[PDB]
């Protein structure tokens, strides 16, 4: 039993970690890109109007 459960735990713990990091990092990078786009739009808008 200890052998089987050891294998299952190792598989779960490694695969879940890699999937989570790979997905979440890209998700946050998109969030930051959108923030940068909004900041650029507002800055250029402001100085253009003024």
């Amino acid at each position: 039993a200890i052998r089987v459960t050891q294998s299952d735990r190792d598989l779960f713990k490694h695969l879940i970690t890699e999937a989570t990091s790979y997905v979440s990092a890209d998700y946050m990078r998109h969030a930051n890109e959108r923030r940068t786009h909004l900041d650029e739009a507002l800055a250029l808008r402001g100085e253009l109007f003024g």
Binding site: A1, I2, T5, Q6, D8, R9, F12, K13, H14, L15, I16, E18, A19, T20, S21, Y22, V23, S24, A25, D26, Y27, M28, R29, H30, A31, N32, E33
Partner: protein
Amino acid sequence: LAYMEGGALRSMSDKALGALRLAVADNEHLRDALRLSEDPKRPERKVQFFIAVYQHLRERIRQDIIRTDDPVDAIEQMEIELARLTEELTAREQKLAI
């Protein structure tokens, strides 16, 4: 992660993908999804890959001994099982027979 520059984020993403390629080598469904995920112009594909991974894990939980549907929560139960089984392994030594 909100307080980091994009270069570090990309470094982590790339190294994670490097690990994933090896982890997912044998499976085909997950391999197809991961393949589809790497075009930057279609973000939802990555979350779809994540959903595929979670569903695939949920089928393998073996609920005979476990009940949580979320795998991340199932890790703690595997840890508890390891501790308990290692404790049961200790000794009895009442050995005497014909």
